[PDB]
Design a protein around this ligand. Structure first.
Ligand SMILES: Cc1cc2nc3c(=O)[nH]c(=O)nc-3n(C[C@H](O)[C@H](O)[C@H](O)COP(=O)(O)O)c2cc1C
Ligand SMILES: Cc1cc2nc3c(=O)[nH]c(=O)nc-3n(C[C@H](O)[C@H](O)[C@H](O)COP(=O)(O)O)c2cc1C
Ligand SMILES: N#Cc1cc(N)ccc1-n1cccc1
Lengths: 306, 306
C-alpha cells in the first residue's frame, strides 16, 4: 500500500516526476505528450519574451555518461507558453510549471507582470531560471529575485546552477532565504561548460562556443544530490526540486533521500521520451517496496551522515 | 618512431604522465614507488607548514564512475617534502613537483621562502594548490600569487579547481596572466563538494562534511578537458597540466588534444597503483600509432571546433 503522492504549492502531484525545463517541453505536441505522460507534473521550455532560434547545430550530443548541450534557449517565446498555461493546459491531469529565462531583469519583470494574472486564474507555477550566469553573480541573483518578488504577487521557484563550495551554498541560501515567495529551489541545471572531445574525430561534438556545453546525465548525479542536500539543509523553509542524473527510480530515491520533493528528468527523458515516467514511477515504487516505505515523506531528506 | 617526450621548465620528461597531487605521494615509500614507476614525473602530497592528520575516515570512496574524497590535507608537513626534494629524490630518474597547500597566504609565503633554495640547488618545481577556496575568490587568488611571486624567485605552477563559466575562465586567466612566474596551470582539482548517497545504506559514503567531497575519475573528464582547453586558449604564455578522468591513453590523448603538456592521474592511479603508468605510456603510444602521430607537439591543443 504505497504512494508517490506529493502535496506542495497548494497542489497534489500523483508522483514527484516531471521533465527538466527545456527537455521535451518546447512545442504544443511536447507539452501535450508531457501532460498525457505518467509524470506528476511538467515544466515548459525556459522562455524569452520573443521566439528564439537558439544556437547553430549540432548543439546537443547524447554521451555514454549523459549529455552535453549549448541549446542557446530555442523557445517559442513567452506568449506561446503563457497561452498554453492560460487556455490549453489540462490542470485536471497535473499541475504546470512555466520556466522563465529572461536575458535581463527587465525581461523577467515584463514577463512576470503578465504571468501574474494567469498564475492567479489557472495556477501555473513560475520556475525562474537563474542558470557570468546570474546565480554565480550573487549581486545579479539578489537583484533579479528582488525585481521578480516586487512585481510577481505569487510564490515561485528558482532553477539553480550547481555550486561546488560551501561558501557559495551559504551565499546562495542566504539570498534565497531573504525571499519568502521563493518556495522551491530546483537543484540543478547542467554542470556548466564541460568540453566533450571525440577521440576518433579529434573534434568537439557541438558547434556553439568552441564545443563547451552544459553536462547532464550520469556526470551530474553526485553534484545534483550535493546541491539538493546543501539547499535542503540551508533553506529549511523551502522545497527542493531535484534535477540531475535521474535514469532510474533508485536515482529518484537518492534525490528524495537528499531532500527532493519533485524529481526532474532531462537527459534520460531526452533519450527515452515520455514513456520513461511509467518506468520511473514503477521503479521508485519497487525501490520503496524492497525498503518497506509507503510514502516519500518517510525518507525525504533522511540521508544518514556518518 | 614515436616519443611521449615533453620539454618544459628547463627539464626533459620521458612521458607526460604523473600522479595527481595527493594520490600515492604522501610517504617516502609512495614517493620512491612513484620515482621507480614508468611515470614521466611525480608531485608530492599537498603540504602544510606542519604535519596534518586529515579528516576522520572513511574520507575516500572508489565509485563505478570515479571517486569522492574529503582527505583534509593529511600530509607529513613541508619540512618532510622539502627534505625529500633536497636530499632523497633521484632527479636522475625524473623531475619532481612539490605541491604546497598553505592554509593562508602567510603559510605559503613562509614555505616558498624556504623552498627557493632547494628549487635553485635541486630543480624541484612548485605546484601551488589554490583549490571559498582561493581560486574561486579572484581578489584573494591575485593576492596569494602577488605574495608568493614576491618571495619565490622561480617558475612555479598553480593547481586550479574547475570553473563552469566563461566569465570565470576569463577572470581566472586574466589574474594568472599577470604572474609570469606562473608558467603552468594544473586543470583540474576535484569537482568540489559532490555528495554520494549509497541507495542500500540510505547514507553518505564519507564521514567528513556530512558526506560532501571532491569528485574524481570518469565524472570529471569533460570538466577537465573544458578547463584545460579554456586555460590553454586564454593563457598562451603558459603550459597546461591536465588532471581529471584519465584511465586510458585515449583519455590522455584527449587531455593533450585539449592542450595538456603533462597529464596527471588521480583516481585511476589510486585504484591501480603505480604500474598504471606502464599501461598509460603503452596505450597513448598505441593511440598515436593508430592516428599516425610521432610526437605530442603534433596534436597538443589542436582539438577541432565545428
Ligand atoms: C536539451 C536540453 C535543454 C535544456 N533546457 C533547459 C532550459 O530551457 N531551462 C533550464 O532551466 N534547464 C535546461 N536544461 C537543463 C535541464 O533542465 C537539467 O537541469 C539538466 O539537463 C540536468 O538534468 P539531467 O541530468 O536529468 O539532464 C536543459 C538540458 C538539456 C539537455
Ligand atoms: C585521495 C586524493 C587526494 C588528493 N589530494 C590532493 C592534494 O593533496 N592536492 C591537490 O592539489 N589535489 C589533490 N587531489 C585531487 C587530485 O589531485 C586530482 O586533481 C583529482 O582527483 C582529479 O583527478 P582524477 O580524475 O584523476 O582523480 C586529491 C584527490 C584524491 C582522490
Ligand atoms: N557561485 C560562484 C562562484 C563565484 C566566484 N566568484 C567564482 C567562482 C564561482 N563558482 C565556482 C564554481 C561555480 C561557480
Amino acid at each position: 500500500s504505497m504512494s508517490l503522492q506529493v502535496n506542495l504549492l497548494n497542489n497534489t502531484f500523483a508522483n514527484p516526476f516531471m521533465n527538466a525545463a527545456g527537455v521535451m517541453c518546447t512545442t504544443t505536441e511536447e507539452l501535450v505528450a508531457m501532460t498525457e505522460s505518467a509524470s506528476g507534473s511538467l515544466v515548459s521550455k525556459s522562455c524569452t519574451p520573443a521566439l528564439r532560434e537558439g544556437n547553430p547545430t549540432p548543439r546537443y550530443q547524447a554521451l555514454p555518461l549523459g549529455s552535453i548541450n549549448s541549446m542557446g534557449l530555442p523557445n517559442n517565446g513567452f506568449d506561446f507558453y503563457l497561452a498554453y498555461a492560460a487556455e490549453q493546459h489540462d490542470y485536471g491531469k497535473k499541475p504546470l510549471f512555466l520556466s522563465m529565462s529572461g536575458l535581463s531583469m527587465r525581461e523577467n519583470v515584463e514577463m512576470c507582470k503578465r504571468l501574474a494574472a494567469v498564475a492567479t486564474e489557472k495556477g501555473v507555477i513560475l520556475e525562474l531560471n537563474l542558470s557570468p550566469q546570474v546565480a554565480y553573480d550573487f549581486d545579479a541573483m539578489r537583484q533579479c529575485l528582488t525585481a521578480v518578488s516586487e512585481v510577481y504577487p505569487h510564490s515561485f521557484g528558482v532553477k539553480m546552477p550547481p555550486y561546488f563550495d560551501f561558501a557559495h551554498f551559504d551565499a546562495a541560501a542566504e539570498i534565497l532565504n531573504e525571499f519568502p515567495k521563493v518556495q522551491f529551489i530546483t537543484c540543478i541545471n547542467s554542470i556548466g561548460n564541460g568540453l566533450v572531445i571525440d577521440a576518433e574525430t579529434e573534434s568537439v561534438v557541438i558547434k556553439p562556443k568552441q564545443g563547451f556545453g552544459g553536462l547532464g546525465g550520469r556526470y551530474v548525479l553526485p553534484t545534483a544530490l550535493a546541491n539538493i542536500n546543501a539547499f535542503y539543509r540551508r533553506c529549511p523553509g523551502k522545497l527542493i526540486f531535484g534535477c540531475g542524473g535521474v535514469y532510474t527510480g533508485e536515482d529518484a530515491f537518492l534525490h528524495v533521500l537528499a531532500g527532493a520533493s519533485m524529481v526532474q528528468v532531462g537527459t534520460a527523458l531526452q533519450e527515452e521520451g515520455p514513456s520513461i515516467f511509467e518506468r520511473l514511477t514503477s521503479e521508485l515504487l519497487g525501490v520503496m517496496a524492497k525498503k518497506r516505505y509507503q510514502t516519500l515523506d518517510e525518507f525525504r531528506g533522511k540521508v544518514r551522515t556518518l
